[PDB]
Amino acid sequence: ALYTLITPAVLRTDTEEQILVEAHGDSTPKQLDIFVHDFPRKQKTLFQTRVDMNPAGGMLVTPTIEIPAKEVSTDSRQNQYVVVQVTGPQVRLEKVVLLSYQSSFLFIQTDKGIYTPGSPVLYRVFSMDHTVIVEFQTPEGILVSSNSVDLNFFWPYNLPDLVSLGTWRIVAKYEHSPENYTAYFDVRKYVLPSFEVRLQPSEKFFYIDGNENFHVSITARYLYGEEVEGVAFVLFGVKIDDAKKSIPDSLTRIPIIDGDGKATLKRDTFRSRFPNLNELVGHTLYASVTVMTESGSDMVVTEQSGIHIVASPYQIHFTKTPKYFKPGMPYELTVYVTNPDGSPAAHVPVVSEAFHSMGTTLSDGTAKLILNIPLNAQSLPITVRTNHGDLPRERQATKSMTAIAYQTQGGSGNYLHVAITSTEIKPGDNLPVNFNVKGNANSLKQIKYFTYLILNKGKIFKVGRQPRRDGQNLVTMNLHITPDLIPSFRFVAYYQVGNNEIVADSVWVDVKDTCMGTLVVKGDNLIQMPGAAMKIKLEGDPGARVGLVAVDKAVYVLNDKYKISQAKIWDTIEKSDFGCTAGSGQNNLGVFEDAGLALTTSTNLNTKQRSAAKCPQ
Amino acid sequence: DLNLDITIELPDREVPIRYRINYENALLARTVETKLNQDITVTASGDGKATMTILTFYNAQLQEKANVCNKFHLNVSVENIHLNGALMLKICTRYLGEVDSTMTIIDISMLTGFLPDAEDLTRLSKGVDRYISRYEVDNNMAQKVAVIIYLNKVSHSEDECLHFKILKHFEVGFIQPGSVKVYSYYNLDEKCTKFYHPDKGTGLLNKICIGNVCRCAGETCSSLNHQERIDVPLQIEKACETNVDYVYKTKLLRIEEQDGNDIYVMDVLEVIKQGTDENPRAKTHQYISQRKCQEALNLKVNDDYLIWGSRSDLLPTKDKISYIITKNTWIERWPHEDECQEEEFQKLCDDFAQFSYTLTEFGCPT
Amino acid sequence: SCSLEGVEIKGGSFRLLQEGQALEYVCPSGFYPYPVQTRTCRSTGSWSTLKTQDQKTVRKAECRAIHCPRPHDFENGEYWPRSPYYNVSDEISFHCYDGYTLRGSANRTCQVNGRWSGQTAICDNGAGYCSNPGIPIGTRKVGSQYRLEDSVTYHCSRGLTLRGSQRRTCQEGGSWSGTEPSCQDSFMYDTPQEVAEAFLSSLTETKRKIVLDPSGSMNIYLVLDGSGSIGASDFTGAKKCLVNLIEKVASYGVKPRYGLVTYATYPKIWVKVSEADSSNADWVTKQLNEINYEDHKLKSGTNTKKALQAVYSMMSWPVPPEGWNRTRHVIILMTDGLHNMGGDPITVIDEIRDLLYIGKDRKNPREDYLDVYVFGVGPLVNQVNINALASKKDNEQHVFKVKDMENLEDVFYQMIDESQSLSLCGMVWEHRKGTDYHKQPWQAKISVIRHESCMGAVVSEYFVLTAAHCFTVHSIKVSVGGEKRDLEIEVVLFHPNYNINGKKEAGIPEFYDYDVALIKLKNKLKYGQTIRPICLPCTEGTTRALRLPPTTTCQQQKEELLPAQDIKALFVSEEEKKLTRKEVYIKNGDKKGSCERDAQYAPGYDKVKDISEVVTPRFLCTGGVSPYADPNTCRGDSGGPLIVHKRSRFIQVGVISWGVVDVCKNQKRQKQVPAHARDFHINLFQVLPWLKEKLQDEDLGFLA
Amino acid sequence: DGFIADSDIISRSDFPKSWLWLTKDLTEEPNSQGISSKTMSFYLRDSITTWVVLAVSFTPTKGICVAEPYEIRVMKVFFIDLQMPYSVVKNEQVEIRAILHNYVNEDIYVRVELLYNPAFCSASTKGQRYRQQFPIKALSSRAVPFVIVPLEQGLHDVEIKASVQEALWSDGVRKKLKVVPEGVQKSIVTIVKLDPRAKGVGGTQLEVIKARKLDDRVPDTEIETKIIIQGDP
Ligand SMILES: *[C@@H]1O[C@H](CO)[C@@H](O[C@@H]2O[C@H](CO)[C@@H](O)[C@H](O)[C@H]2NC(C)=O)[C@H](O)[C@H]1NC(C)=O
Ligand SMILES: *[C@@H]1O[C@H](CO)[C@@H](O)[C@H](O)[C@H]1NC(C)=O
Ligand SMILES: *[C@@H]1O[C@H](CO)[C@@H](O)[C@H](O)[C@H]1NC(C)=O
Ligand SMILES: *[C@@H]1O[C@H](CO)[C@@H](O)[C@H](O)[C@H]1NC(C)=O
Ligand SMILES: [Mg+2]
Ligand SMILES: [Mg+2]
């Protein structure tokens, strides 16, 4: 007498999307039909199938739908929706779902990051799964190349001898998709210098109101190994947006001896130029190093940028904890502490003095703090501060948030909380999961099973059932963490009460970002005569297609910002996630909405529409 | 809606270029490259609109400033000195700006086989206002061919002169000019450069220039050949090498002078061996050397000469056959007729005749 | 005169030229005389410096290994391996980057003449208006944009000269102007087979035909250089070449208006196109047979300009005539490029070009209406100069340089042979498709079931010549031309003197004297591109093949083929279903005594006392390490032909019989072999009564 | 005389900024831990530097994977290092500074020639290379300036060769020097609005843009015209 449909809040093209159909208070084997039509006019049948739901599969099926892009192409924007329908004996469910054309995540590799007029730009496009449009834009934003490319053969782009200088863009997109991956590359009339210059700052930050000086260590090496010897010029300044304001009196000439030099900025010289501290808030301190060989033969210009001028060495973030609690239950607070640039910060102790709860951050810069919420409270102010043994109380960071209470349906006082103790979670790990229930006695006896979803990369990946032997206030389940769950995954779980009320919760879990497979280039590591025979071993997964490239360290040292990395890849995935929050919700419907899910029930409990696929900022 | 047809006709080809622009590809810019400044005819049939930008790139003359030290004045001289080879190097410089120039750099290269006098250099490095990277010393010479001196500043009002001795380490054939660059931290681009050499004013390698076409003039001077007897068999072979174009007897009419160059105007009296120049006797032949070579040559007006040269050395002078005098050019004094009597020249003139004849009559042996 | 002391040469030899006014050296194969091939006499008593290309002294003249040029740049891909230089028979491979397709020869092998096999490899993105011109191995290319009207320039590593276009422009047509460049050493040469193919391939289009326009006409100007530099011998030899060129051309149906000019200090005209006769090939051939080298001896300079102006005279007109822009012009120049009077010959071409309206319209090239071919006599050729004269046409070669005046005759002699009659003995036309058997048509595999696999040569349409020791006692089969099909044979003809047991009495097992046999097939053979006869000693076919008069005796042939010296010969060996020419030397001079003496080391002869017992006047002898290390035969090669490759033809002089050491493993190499491992061959000259007899009714036509 | 013969010295020339743009497939049998290992051979270019090899694999179940870079360090004991500017002006005398790097732990006596190139005026000539001879302390660098005057426009090779006396140590470098003509590159801009429809239903615009007037132009240099067309949004 209760039927539920649950699908990803956003469906991707042109790839496999698992959905969820459930029968509660029923056990009569059925035959459900699954239709996917365009919306609104339902002019055609995009996908269709028939499915068997019986007590063997616990009255619960996971069909795979697939929406071809040939069939719903309409160069509209404003956009497109489709409609999922489930029909059967006594089962009539349907959900209008938002449609996305990004069939999967694309990434672009160019051979070099910097080019000369009149040379070829070689490139590849990669897909996370297995058509595509590739576009070239001039630094003036003009489109000069548009091609439909095959995923295993690309045409090199050739810069004219009279090319336009500046930063160029390569754009890869699926046709109709307003979403795009974008690589950059510079075209400069430029000779690659014969040596690299590496910069190492004294501190990761600069106290806006401090007393200490600031050092920048310099290292210079010829690209073949040995140490550069010469002279360096360092000029400091403050970067306000992109307007640089220099500290002229800071200009120092410095000897490079055995490749090493050390340039200093006096707090004196800094105070003299920027007396009013107000002008310095939220801005960064930079250093423009300029090294010359002793022979006058060559010169390199680097820059140390993005040294934030701050009041504290740390930032506190509540971006990784739920903004909703469950009265009378242990709330799980996950503090995120970063350095001023945004990187994780390990071994930082934190405290919430209101709850006298302590904890230090781990390698990912997080600390899980358990708080015991009073049985009655509805609003909940949480303040957290850093407590590092090396800082005066005045240099500690602090942040506040407010968590609201999860609204029960009909005011039942029926709750569900999912908890996970483990931290720094890697693939291979086995993970204890905890289903905790609190509420009405007449209700907690009807709970006969928990349904859970394992959401990863915008997609339902696995669904399961956890039995609950009557009386069990706490039910533990194991969960193997496989390379499929990188970069992170969501655990959404709910239970039903009297075929009417839905009580639910969700958790966001982070996984150690690496490769799902392996790839390692191995060599003997000896020094080489020019034009010598070389042998290198490629080690990776069976059936791997490996793209190679050799780059002079003269470039590759240049424009690190533009190079592709394993990290840049995962950050794109994560920014593209359809779930917008760290867990829970204002209420049952809010738990799904926030986890990037859609639900419709036979009682007509419906997750609201989606106003765009990107999550609010 | 938008749907435009384009035809672009260019005199450089027959097949014209056809384009179709519409909604699906209007963001895309269509480009056509040609290497000619000729008429372009464009037609357009259809519905939509479009902007056609025609960009012509050429090389334009600039106001006669070339390298011109824009930010500094730089004077580099060098003079010989008594030291019982070795010279004194004076470098004067001044920032042309509104204020003294922060962190200035004086880049210096040595003449071939010269090094900076150790003591004089050590005396230069001394100062709270200076820096010179470390240098080793042997035989009282700083073992640095490139010597950079980093100054904390340089005046914009008064010139700032500095000098040191340079000494001859290894003794080589030709002395390459040295150079001096000047620049500062806030001015690392249009580097001011002067050259210097003991034998040269501006320290410039010897070249000759008609317009924008320059040829290497050589470092050694070319001189009048003088045998007092001609080995006709062998003198013949020499004029019959594969890179000898012609062999003339000439008379020297005038000596005109343009831009520090000597134009020796020859009239061709006899074609001893026919060269490419099909009708040489009807034209005046200009032979060009630089003035600093007046005396090594020693050509005198209204004398006769046996001149034979190489096609390569033909110069792009309009409406005038011109040659550059080279080591690939042979010039010998040809005794006048009223001179052949004087015993001083008798048998020389005979070998001269037995030469002009054997060639104009039989040609080369091979 | 000059003293012949100190004129040695490691692992090699030499022979005096011009009575002794300019000697010259001879190396094996894949070896070149360092530093110079010839010296010139100084009136001091000593021949000359041992300088070089550059001007520095060397102290012991040697035969170096020929080297193939290392790629300077290969665009858009990698090549394997990278060596400082490449040895003969070395392999180099080319692979392309992602996004680029390889045109040209993916793999390339270094050939015995310093040239790479196949054509120039190129990695192309197919994006240029034209293709990627590529970088011919040995050159350096400037310019990487291949849009319409772009140019690329080529130059060669200093010490080499460029052949072809130094600059090429992308044209409306889609092709590049000029012709693909290549790099040339002082020692590199064109084999006559290459020149023959290259020239006709350019001169005509394809059984070939000369392409005239409808109601058109052709004018051929033969300009010969007669300056002192050429020499007398090397002159009348070029006169011969032009004779054969006259025949060859005439046989292409079209009657061309000829022109004949020899030159030196001055040009002398021997035939003008304007004349009503021209066209008579007998008239012109007669005028040509007239010319003597003493016609220029007096004024013996090299004024090439005047010589071409002569041709510019025969082209000009009063008003323009009728059928002028319809006549094809073709210049054949035979100089050494060493012009030294008159100036740059080129200025006359550019004069002619404007007279024929050539290259004066972007809607009409008219490039077809002029061809200039230049043939370089031999060492002391200025390749820069004979190149700037020759036409530069895409995909065709117009400039040639050959080892000696001998080889240049070989060119035109081989043209009259393409010419036809596949029944022509020992004739192999070098088609570039390699294809094994195409290069040794006469080869016959043999198998006698029992098993045994000998070799043989196809002498007539009925007969196969082989060794007699392969048989004793339907049971036997022959296979040819790479034909699986094995042929029925009628009867074996042993030589009447042959007897493998002739001296089993004296404890000497096998006695290989008179070891020859003929196999008459049951079915006549039909010749073809992969089945031809080979020449036999003492036939009219051979006298003709050697370029001799019908009044040539049998002894004169022997004195020509098997002289008392070290003779350059070759046999055919099968190494894994591929046929290769192994080059050996017939020790017939001072070394002949010691070659035979190695007979008593051969198996079985442990009891042999005087080698005259087992080495008879019927045997020739090869193998060993003097003068050079010669490859050896195998059991599987036994019976095969021992060939001499003279004047562009293949004459069999012997039959492979026995060896002193089994050097075969199989495989063969060893890699190194005893110095005493000689090979003995039946000298066909010593079995002529028996040959003439059994082969009387066969069309071979013997002599004495 | 003690030195290595020029012809024996092969100059380095092949200095690509990037190469080995290839793709390979991991087809080999996996091992105990499910990893397929593929040996791969290739030859290095001429650059004396460190090459960085970057791999990026994709499999159908394991997505994209970027490998940590394998570095290759290439170096000679004795060698020339030549830094060229992006370009030099025609006819205008410039200094080129080479550097002899001795990384042998002993003092050496070297010979350095500049090769003759007709595109340049310099100390070298068709008959006589410009030769210097000098010592170098154990492990020192040393600068060697070369003064030259570009005479032709385009890309032209500068080749320097060095050899150590009484030893087998030699190096040569051949780099390309970009030579642009005198003056400043300007450009004329003509704009034309294409609207055929503005002339009726059967609309044609015919625009004759004649040869552009540009009489500042240095004679005998290349002219390049670009005709660009953008569509209306
Ligand atoms: C052809 O033969 C020569 C040997 O004379 C090879 O020369 C190589 O380089 C030098 C000169 O002998 C030696 O040090 C090497 O041993 C030779 N090769 C090796 C083994 O590295 C030359 O390499 C050969 N051609 C090839 C194989 O490219
Ligand atoms: C790529 O996405 C963003 C969306 O703002 C933007 O840079 C641009 O509109 C897109 N690029 C395209 C459509 O080529
Ligand atoms: C340098 O220039 C100054 C003028 O500012 C002049 O007085 C001096 O003589 C010059 N020195 C030279 C020519 O070296
Ligand atoms: C080139 O050679 C290799 C082996 O040497 C071979 O695998 C490849 O197929 C060859 N390519 C050809 C024949 O073009
Ligand atoms: Mg993660
Ligand atoms: Mg001659």
Side-chain angles (χ1 to χ4, degrees), chain A residues 8 12 16-17 105 128-129 453-462 481-492 508-509 511 513 516 570 573-574 577-579 595-597:
Chain A
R12 289 194 223 271
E16 310 187 325
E17 291 284 83
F105 309 100
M128 278 287 284
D129 278 6
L453 278 67
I454 303 283
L455 313 180
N456 158 281
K457 301 186 198 76
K459 294 187 176 177
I460 292 181
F461 162 76
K462 176 170 67 176
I481 305 285
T482 61
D484 282 322
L485 298 179
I486 313 184
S488 75
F489 72 82
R490 274 200 183 71
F491 200 93
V492 188
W508 182 80
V509 195
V511 186
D513 303 350
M516 284 183 270
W570 291 129
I573 316 296
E574 292 269 59
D577 193 19
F578 300 126
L597 288 182

Coordinates of all heavy atoms in Angstrom, one line a residue, chain A residues 8 12 16-17 105 128-129 453-462 481-492 508-509 511 513 516 570 573-574 577-579 595-597:
Chain A
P8 N 18.4 9.5 -9.4 CA 19.4 10.7 -9.4 C 18.6 11.9 -9.8 O 17.8 11.9 -10.7 CB 20.3 10.3 -10.5 CG 20.4 8.8 -10.5 CD 19.0 8.3 -10.0
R12 N 22.2 11.8 -16.7 CA 23.2 12.1 -17.7 C 22.8 11.4 -19.0 O 21.9 10.6 -19.0 CB 24.6 11.7 -17.2 CG 25.1 12.6 -16.1 CD 26.6 12.3 -15.9 NE 27.0 12.3 -14.5 CZ 27.3 13.3 -13.8 NH1 27.4 14.5 -14.4 NH2 27.7 13.2 -12.5
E16 N 24.8 4.8 -18.3 CA 23.9 4.0 -17.5 C 23.5 4.7 -16.2 O 24.3 5.2 -15.4 CB 24.6 2.6 -17.1 CG 25.1 1.9 -18.3 CD 25.6 0.5 -17.9 OE1 26.1 0.3 -16.7 OE2 25.5 -0.4 -18.7
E17 N 22.2 4.8 -16.0 CA 21.7 5.4 -14.7 C 20.7 4.4 -14.0 O 19.7 4.1 -14.5 CB 20.9 6.7 -15.1 CG 21.7 7.9 -15.6 CD 22.5 8.6 -14.5 OE1 23.6 8.1 -14.1 OE2 22.0 9.6 -14.0
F105 N 32.9 12.9 -17.8 CA 33.9 13.9 -17.5 C 35.0 13.8 -18.5 O 35.7 12.8 -18.7 CB 34.4 13.9 -16.1 CG 33.3 13.9 -15.1 CD1 32.9 12.7 -14.5 CD2 32.7 15.0 -14.7 CE1 31.9 12.7 -13.5 CE2 31.7 15.0 -13.8 CZ 31.3 13.8 -13.2
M128 N 36.3 9.7 -18.7 CA 36.2 8.8 -17.5 C 35.5 7.5 -17.9 O 35.7 6.5 -17.2 CB 35.6 9.5 -16.3 CG 36.5 10.4 -15.6 SD 37.7 9.5 -14.6 CE 36.6 8.9 -13.2
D129 N 34.6 7.6 -18.8 CA 33.8 6.5 -19.2 C 33.9 6.1 -20.7 O 34.7 6.7 -21.4 CB 32.3 6.7 -18.9 CG 31.9 6.4 -17.5 OD1 32.9 6.1 -16.7 OD2 30.7 6.4 -17.2
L453 N 21.3 3.8 0.0 CA 21.8 4.1 -1.3 C 23.3 4.5 -1.1 O 23.7 5.2 -0.2 CB 21.1 5.2 -1.9 CG 19.8 4.9 -2.7 CD1 18.7 4.4 -1.7 CD2 19.3 6.1 -3.5
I454 N 24.1 4.1 -2.1 CA 25.5 4.5 -2.2 C 25.7 5.4 -3.4 O 26.0 4.8 -4.5 CB 26.4 3.2 -2.3 CG1 26.2 2.3 -1.1 CG2 27.9 3.6 -2.3 CD1 26.8 2.7 0.2
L455 N 25.6 6.7 -3.2 CA 25.7 7.6 -4.3 C 27.2 8.0 -4.6 O 27.9 8.5 -3.7 CB 24.9 8.8 -4.1 CG 23.4 8.6 -3.6 CD1 22.7 10.0 -3.4 CD2 22.7 7.8 -4.6
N456 N 27.6 7.9 -5.8 CA 28.9 8.3 -6.2 C 29.0 8.8 -7.7 O 28.7 8.1 -8.6 CB 29.9 7.1 -6.1 CG 31.1 7.2 -6.9 OD1 31.1 6.9 -8.1 ND2 32.2 7.6 -6.3
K457 N 29.5 10.1 -7.8 CA 29.6 10.7 -9.1 C 28.3 11.1 -9.8 O 28.2 11.0 -11.0 CB 30.5 9.9 -10.1 CG 31.9 9.6 -9.6 CD 32.7 9.0 -10.6 CE 33.9 8.3 -10.1 NZ 33.6 7.0 -9.4
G458 N 27.3 11.5 -9.0 CA 26.0 11.8 -9.5 C 25.1 10.6 -9.7 O 23.9 10.8 -10.1
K459 N 25.6 9.4 -9.6 CA 24.9 8.2 -9.9 C 24.7 7.3 -8.7 O 25.5 7.2 -7.8 CB 25.7 7.4 -10.9 CG 25.9 8.0 -12.3 CD 26.5 7.0 -13.2 CE 26.6 7.5 -14.6 NZ 27.3 6.5 -15.5
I460 N 23.5 6.7 -8.7 CA 23.3 5.6 -7.7 C 24.2 4.5 -8.2 O 24.2 4.1 -9.4 CB 21.8 5.1 -7.8 CG1 20.8 6.1 -7.2 CG2 21.6 3.8 -7.0 CD1 19.4 5.7 -7.2
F461 N 25.0 3.9 -7.3 CA 26.0 2.9 -7.6 C 25.6 1.6 -7.0 O 25.8 0.6 -7.7 CB 27.3 3.4 -7.1 CG 28.4 2.3 -7.0 CD1 29.0 1.8 -8.1 CD2 28.7 1.8 -5.7 CE1 29.9 0.8 -8.0 CE2 29.7 0.8 -5.6 CZ 30.3 0.3 -6.8
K462 N 25.2 1.5 -5.8 CA 24.7 0.3 -5.2 C 23.6 0.6 -4.2 O 23.5 1.7 -3.7 CB 25.9 -0.3 -4.4 CG 25.5 -1.6 -3.6 CD 26.7 -2.3 -3.0 CE 27.4 -1.5 -1.9 NZ 28.5 -2.2 -1.3
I481 N 35.0 -0.8 0.9 CA 35.3 0.4 0.2 C 36.2 0.1 -1.0 O 37.4 -0.1 -0.8 CB 35.9 1.5 1.0 CG1 35.1 1.8 2.2 CG2 36.1 2.8 0.2 CD1 33.8 2.6 1.9
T482 N 35.7 0.2 -2.2 CA 36.4 -0.2 -3.4 C 36.8 1.0 -4.2 O 36.2 2.1 -4.0 CB 35.6 -1.2 -4.3 OG1 34.4 -0.5 -4.7 CG2 35.2 -2.4 -3.4
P483 N 37.7 0.9 -5.1 CA 38.2 2.0 -5.9 C 37.1 2.8 -6.7 O 37.3 3.8 -7.3 CB 39.2 1.4 -6.9 CG 39.7 0.2 -6.2 CD 38.5 -0.3 -5.4
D484 N 35.9 2.2 -6.7 CA 34.7 2.8 -7.3 C 34.2 4.1 -6.6 O 33.6 4.9 -7.2 CB 33.6 1.8 -7.4 CG 33.8 0.8 -8.6 OD1 34.3 1.2 -9.6 OD2 33.4 -0.4 -8.4
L485 N 34.6 4.2 -5.3 CA 34.0 5.2 -4.4 C 34.8 6.5 -4.4 O 34.4 7.5 -3.8 CB 33.7 4.7 -3.0 CG 32.7 3.5 -3.0 CD1 32.5 3.0 -1.5 CD2 31.4 4.0 -3.5
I486 N 36.0 6.5 -5.0 CA 36.8 7.7 -5.1 C 36.0 8.6 -6.0 O 35.4 8.2 -7.0 CB 38.2 7.4 -5.8 CG1 38.8 6.2 -5.1 CG2 39.1 8.5 -5.7 CD1 40.2 5.8 -5.6
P487 N 36.1 9.9 -5.8 CA 36.8 10.7 -4.8 C 36.1 10.8 -3.5 O 36.7 11.1 -2.4 CB 36.8 12.1 -5.4 CG 36.1 12.1 -6.7 CD 35.2 10.8 -6.6
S488 N 34.8 10.5 -3.5 CA 33.9 10.6 -2.3 C 32.6 9.9 -2.7 O 32.3 9.7 -3.8 CB 33.7 12.0 -1.9 OG 32.8 12.6 -2.7
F489 N 31.9 9.5 -1.6 CA 30.5 8.9 -1.9 C 29.5 9.3 -0.8 O 29.9 9.7 0.3 CB 30.6 7.4 -2.0 CG 30.9 6.7 -0.6 CD1 29.9 6.5 0.3 CD2 32.2 6.3 -0.3 CE1 30.1 5.9 1.5 CE2 32.5 5.7 0.9 CZ 31.4 5.5 1.8
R490 N 28.3 9.2 -1.1 CA 27.2 9.5 -0.1 C 26.5 8.3 0.3 O 26.2 7.4 -0.5 CB 26.2 10.5 -0.7 CG 26.6 11.9 -0.5 CD 25.4 12.9 -0.7 NE 25.8 14.3 -0.6 CZ 26.4 14.9 -1.6 NH1 26.8 14.2 -2.7 NH2 26.7 16.2 -1.4
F491 N 26.2 8.2 1.6 CA 25.4 7.1 2.2 C 24.0 7.7 2.5 O 23.9 8.5 3.5 CB 26.1 6.5 3.4 CG 25.6 5.1 3.7 CD1 26.2 4.0 3.3 CD2 24.4 5.0 4.5 CE1 25.8 2.8 3.6 CE2 24.0 3.7 4.8 CZ 24.7 2.6 4.4
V492 N 23.0 7.4 1.8 CA 21.6 7.8 2.1 C 20.8 6.6 2.5 O 20.9 5.5 1.9 CB 20.9 8.5 0.9 CG1 19.6 9.0 1.3 CG2 21.8 9.5 0.3
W508 N 27.9 12.2 4.1 CA 28.9 12.3 3.0 C 30.2 11.8 3.6 O 30.6 12.1 4.7 CB 29.0 13.8 2.6 CG 30.0 14.0 1.5 CD1 29.8 13.8 0.2 CD2 31.4 14.5 1.7 NE1 31.0 14.1 -0.5 CE2 31.9 14.5 0.4 CE3 32.2 14.8 2.8 CZ2 33.2 15.0 0.1 CZ3 33.5 15.3 2.5 CH2 34.0 15.3 1.2
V509 N 30.8 10.9 2.8 CA 32.1 10.3 3.2 C 33.2 10.6 2.2 O 32.9 10.6 1.0 CB 31.9 8.7 3.3 CG1 33.1 8.1 4.0 CG2 30.6 8.4 4.0
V511 N 36.9 9.8 0.5 CA 37.9 8.7 0.2 C 39.2 9.3 -0.3 O 39.2 10.3 -1.0 CB 37.3 7.8 -0.9 CG1 38.2 6.5 -1.1 CG2 35.9 7.3 -0.5
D513 N 41.9 10.3 -2.4 CA 41.9 10.4 -3.9 C 43.2 9.9 -4.5 O 44.3 10.4 -4.1 CB 41.8 11.9 -4.3 CG 40.5 12.5 -3.8 OD1 39.6 11.8 -3.3 OD2 40.4 13.8 -3.9
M516 N 42.1 4.9 -9.8 CA 41.3 3.7 -9.6 C 42.2 2.5 -10.0 O 42.0 1.4 -9.5 CB 40.0 3.7 -10.4 CG 38.9 4.6 -9.8 SD 37.4 4.6 -10.7 CE 37.7 5.9 -11.9
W570 N 39.9 15.0 -10.1 CA 39.0 14.7 -9.0 C 38.3 15.9 -8.5 O 37.1 15.9 -8.1 CB 39.7 14.0 -7.8 CG 40.2 12.6 -8.1 CD1 41.4 12.1 -7.9 CD2 39.4 11.6 -8.7 NE1 41.5 10.8 -8.3 CE2 40.2 10.4 -8.8 CE3 38.1 11.5 -9.1 CZ2 39.8 9.2 -9.3 CZ3 37.6 10.3 -9.7 CH2 38.5 9.2 -9.8
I573 N 35.3 16.5 -10.9 CA 34.2 15.5 -10.5 C 33.4 16.1 -9.3 O 32.2 16.2 -9.4 CB 34.8 14.2 -10.1 CG1 35.9 13.7 -11.1 CG2 33.7 13.1 -10.0 CD1 35.4 13.5 -12.5
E574 N 34.2 16.4 -8.2 CA 33.6 16.9 -7.0 C 32.8 18.2 -7.2 O 31.7 18.3 -6.5 CB 34.6 17.1 -5.9 CG 35.3 15.8 -5.5 CD 34.6 15.2 -4.2 OE1 33.4 14.9 -4.3 OE2 35.2 15.0 -3.2
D577 N 29.4 17.4 -8.7 CA 28.5 16.5 -7.9 C 27.1 17.2 -7.8 O 27.0 18.4 -7.7 CB 29.0 16.3 -6.5 CG 28.3 15.2 -5.8 OD1 27.6 14.4 -6.4 OD2 28.5 15.1 -4.5
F578 N 26.0 16.4 -7.8 CA 24.7 16.9 -7.8 C 24.2 17.1 -6.3 O 23.2 17.9 -6.1 CB 23.7 16.0 -8.5 CG 24.1 15.8 -10.0 CD1 24.3 14.6 -10.5 CD2 24.2 17.0 -10.8 CE1 24.6 14.5 -11.9 CE2 24.5 16.8 -12.1 CZ 24.7 15.6 -12.7
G579 N 24.8 16.4 -5.4 CA 24.5 16.6 -4.0 C 25.2 17.9 -3.5 O 26.4 18.1 -3.8
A595 N 21.0 15.5 -1.1 CA 21.9 14.5 -1.5 C 21.9 14.2 -3.0 O 22.6 13.3 -3.5 CB 21.6 13.2 -0.8
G596 N 21.2 15.1 -3.7 CA 21.1 15.0 -5.2 C 20.2 13.9 -5.6 O 20.6 13.1 -6.6
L597 N 19.1 13.7 -5.0 CA 18.1 12.7 -5.3 C 16.7 13.2 -5.5 O 16.4 14.3 -5.1 CB 18.1 11.6 -4.2 CG 19.3 10.7 -4.1 CD1 19.1 9.6 -3.0 CD2 19.6 10.0 -5.5

